Paper text:
The most recent expansion has been coupled with a diversification of structure and biochemical function that has given rise to enzymes that are introduced into the host cell, and likely possess novel substrate specificities.
To explore the catalytic capacity of nematode GS-like genes, the [name] representative of Clade 1 (Gpa-gss1), one representative from Clade 2 (Gpa-gss5) and a number from Clade 3 (Gpa-gss12, Gpa-gss17, Gpa-[name], Gpa-gss24 and Gpa-gss30) were heterologously expressed in, and their proteins purified from, bacteria. In contrast, none of the Clade 3 GS-like effectors accepted any of the tested terminal amino acid substrates in combination with the γ-EC backbone. Comparison between Gpa-[name]-open and–closed reveals a functioning ATP grasp fold. In contrast, there is considerably more variation in the di-peptide binding pocket of [name] GS-like effectors, yet, this variation is not evenly distributed around the pocket. However, the glutamate of the di-peptide is exclusively coordinated by interactions with charged side chains of residues in the binding pocket (R, E, 2xQ, N, and Y). All six of these positions are substituted in Gpa-[name] and Gpa-GSS30, thus suggesting that the lack of canonical activity is because γ-EC is not accepted despite the potential for cysteine to be accommodated.
Numbering used by the authors:
A (entry chain A): 29 to 160, 167 to 401, 408 to 491, 502 to 510
B (entry chain C): 27 to 160, 168 to 374, 429 to 490, 502 to 510
The structure:
Amino acid sequence: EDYVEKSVNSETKLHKLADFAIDWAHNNGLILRTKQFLNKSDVAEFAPVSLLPSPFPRHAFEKAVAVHEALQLLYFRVACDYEFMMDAYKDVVNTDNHLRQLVNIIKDAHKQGIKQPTTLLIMRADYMLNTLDEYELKQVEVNTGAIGGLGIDRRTTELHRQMLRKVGMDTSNSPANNGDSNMIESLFMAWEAFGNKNALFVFLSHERLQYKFELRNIQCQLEELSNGQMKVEYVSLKAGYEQLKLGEDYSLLLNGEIVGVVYSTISALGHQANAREMEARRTIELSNAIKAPSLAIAISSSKKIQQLLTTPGTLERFFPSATEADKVAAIRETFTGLWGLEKSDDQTERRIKDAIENPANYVLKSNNFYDEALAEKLRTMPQAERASHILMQKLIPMATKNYFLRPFHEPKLNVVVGELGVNGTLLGNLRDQSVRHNVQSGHLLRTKLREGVGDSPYLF
Amino acid sequence: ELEDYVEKSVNSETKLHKLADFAIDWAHNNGLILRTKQFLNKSDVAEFAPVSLLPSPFPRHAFEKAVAVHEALQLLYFRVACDYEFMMDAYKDVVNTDNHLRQLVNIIKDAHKQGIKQPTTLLIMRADYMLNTLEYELKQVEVNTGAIGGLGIDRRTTELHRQMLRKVGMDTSNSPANNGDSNMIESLFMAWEAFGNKNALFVFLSHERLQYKFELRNIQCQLEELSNGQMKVEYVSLKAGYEQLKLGEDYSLLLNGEIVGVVYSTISALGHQANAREMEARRTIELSNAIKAPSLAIAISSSKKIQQLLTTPGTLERFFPSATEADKVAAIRETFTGLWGHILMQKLIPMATKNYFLRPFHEPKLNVVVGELGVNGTLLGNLRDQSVRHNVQSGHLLRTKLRGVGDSPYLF
Ligand SMILES: Nc1ncnc2c1ncn2[C@@H]1O[C@H](COP(=O)(O)OP(=O)(O)O)[C@@H](O)[C@H]1O
Ligand SMILES: Nc1ncnc2c1ncn2[C@@H]1O[C@H](COP(=O)(O)OP(=O)(O)O)[C@@H](O)[C@H]1O
Ligand SMILES: [Mg+2]
Ligand SMILES: [Mg+2]
Ligand SMILES: [Mg+2]
Ligand SMILES: [Mg+2]
Ligand SMILES: [Mg+2]
């Protein structure tokens, strides 16, 4: 399919469609704070997006959506398996102080005993298409720890349905995208589970952020759902050092008030936190607040754990019963090759040799090098760094054409590639590993120049 | 009274910023926005519409009076617009000193000589009132008929103010419903159907550089929804209209060769000082069979001179001759203050209150302020026989200045 080129047949049509889309974005809240004023909402720009929804195979979309609940159950169980988590991090700990401080928080939480059984896992699974013209769906990453912008994603779908109508195309191949509703319902469900209507709901978030309008949408809808009863607050880890305390009953206290939910948009793995920020993370973690997500759930989505999960028998540790072989198989077929660099087997040294000699087949990742950069990193890597890196099979994605809409850039025709993101939530119990609500809801396309922007799939 | 609840409800700089911060984010999330001053030709960035932090106190009696009289006020000005002899007489002297008004009246003269080609027209009116101090009486300051918009801004302002009221623990039932934007759209769609050709364009006669572009886009999307994707919309200015608008040999209005069924003006006939090319576009529009929202005669019926003439004894009774319509005449007349034949007007002394202004990049503070109540509506009429298909009041606003910004009433 190259319907985008077929549907946009002049510069006059390009500007008429772009102009409409930009105004639509502002009118429907598909917006971010400007880079110039990340601390201020006085002005806002539209979220960067494709002009039309990028073609995506229907089979691959259906596969990715279908496996998500089982994928969420997997990572929930991984997070709950203390012995597995400590073993996966035993080497990485010695070379990386950020990950050491985080694992020590989890160690301290485990030895004090868990004070709050209810937790909310929030996951995005990312996939690319890999070429065989037929394509297989393969998983690139899993993200737990800080998931947001689901309102941006829905609005992007809605925009694309409008754009499809404008160029005379059927909108039934644009799938429904209501993740933001699940986010809010799940967050509200978590707030009720705390069992104290005077307990605060806290957005653990940066002061300077593009996504502030998105968080405000969650706030308004949470307040509506609680009939004005839920008090909401915003705090960063920097400010949390002074403002968050652990009460003598293990309550989380924000300026002395009980907090019932901490919804993190500050990634535990992604955000390089200083010593004051880690002490706030610790305080949160040792408290009886429902965490969305808990630290153990946040750090379960590292590249090392992604790699370990591909080793035979490892998936079966979390799904031991023959009744769950269908989940194991469905997850396994979305994996491509991943390998660790830690040990001195002959299997690993041959893998390293293969990648040095044939680097176009690989991507080298830390907790990203390509081609001769990859071969050189492998040649010159110190003994210590081996454990903080994994080898992954290189995926060759489907290429299409599309226009990008970005603040203050003329749109033009680019060759582009998509990355499919599938979102969901799981509300669970850490003590007995039961599940109250495990759903897939919401998706996106992230589209880049091949040689990026928000996008949504048009299924074929 | 509830006359300084704003001061009572906002008792620190900390509370002021927490409320302001919430309101600004709410505005962007709900489309209470305008294009930036820096980039009036571009929608890439947008700022929030300037508004009061809380809804300004306004007497319930005065609001109810202004809303109640509106349909009769609309009927009055419709009938004024349709009375060619009255309009020419009101402008006979003014014409000789003012070239802008001369060109406009000459368009109406040329339309009258050719015979009017489209009987259906849509009057869009805002009546402005100030409170006058004695207790307060409601008095009319102005009537506006040639370019009315921003009713979506007004509704959203009401919605914002209901949110702010909840945040400071105040009852929202004294904030009246404000759904003028829906009437605007329904009335505009009604006008488009009355043309009787689903392939006919709907045209926003509008500036290219304007803060209100997002508002017009909202109307576009809702008109397209209401037509089930059938209505084609376009935008054109009078500058661009010189070359792009033509009068067809059957009196069709042609925008780049396509038939136009409705011309909705947001370029004021009295307010916008138009050049010679722009007046020829205005003429083309006016001589065509497009339904005009509003027609030029309706737009120029709302001059200060006509406002003044309407206060002279027996002049209201020209348009409402029957004893049966003396109740309308009396209800309209009690909202008039003194006017005499520019023109002399009696000075009104408005009610003062306190409020905070939210404006892009300026810290809010407590100001002494005065309000001006705007009441909106539409009338879909027939110029040939003077009949009326739809005459409703819908929508209002407060415009609040330092003794400005968008505001909404909190009734007491
Ligand atoms: N196996 C792979 N083959 C090809 N490209 C990849 C592969 N893995 C990652 N990439 C590219 O690199 C990008 C970033 O790396 P990723 O591992 O997803 O980490 P993160 O999203 O946390 O930065 C991906 O979005 C994708 O475009
Ligand atoms: N009779 C009056 N007494 C006091 N102020 C007036 C009077 N008439 C007009 N004003 C003030 O002048 C402003 C603008 O005048 P107006 O006649 O409404 O023209 P326009 O709104 O078309 O510019 C009003 O908003 C009001 O503040
Ligand atoms: Mg990624
Ligand atoms: Mg990850
Ligand atoms: Mg099964
Ligand atoms: Mg005025
Ligand atoms: Mg006037």
